[PDB]
Amino acid sequence: VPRGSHMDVEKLRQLYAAGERDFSIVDLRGAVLENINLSGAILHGAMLDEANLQQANLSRADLSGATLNGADLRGANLSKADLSDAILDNAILEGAILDEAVLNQANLKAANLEQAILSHANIREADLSEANLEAADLSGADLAIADLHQANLHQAALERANLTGANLEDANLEGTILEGG
Template sequence: MDAIELQMLYAAGERDFRNIDLSSASLSYINLSQATLIRANFRHANLRWANLREANLSWADLRGADLSWADLRGADLSHARLKGAKMPDGTIHD
């Protein structure tokens, strides 16, 4: 699945994207609020300005991802892999 297909499925009402692999994808400004993204691979993805509000990102791989200005309010990041991720506040997760 690529970013365009993901956006089309989300717009059609799909919210369950478990185990999706979008490593290194350009996903800036994407809206995935309230999506289930358990074990998703967003390693090195560009998620700048993404709307991930209330998304379930538990066990997701976000290593090296750019989450600058992303909306993560209410998102579940339990057990997510964040090493090297650029967080919304501009810090790099260690």
């Protein structure tokens, strides 16, 4: 498993296919990882900034502490993945599936999560300031003490979501269970 040098995507595929799951701290910056299946991979602390992860299968992956600044995760599946303490500022997660993921203390400033599925996710203390959550499914999610200032939650599903202590200043709440309240 290459460490200290940039990981080739073909090498990553071969290793995963051989049964390897520990890709902690690997350097995949800018890598073209679209459609890759890395389900269950350990990517703890990995450098995935700017990566193309369109429609990647990252279900049950451990991405805790990884850096994903500006990464393209459009349509990726992160069901039950761990993204605690990850950095996803300015990442693109449109249509991504993060059902039952954990994102506690993640950084998602100005991330695009339009139409993302975050049902029953742990999103406690995340920075979602200026994020786009238009039509995102946050059903039953925990956003305790999250920063949502200036976030777009237009038509988001906040039913049964916990927003206790969250910063909702200048957030768009039109179409949600909170509209008009």
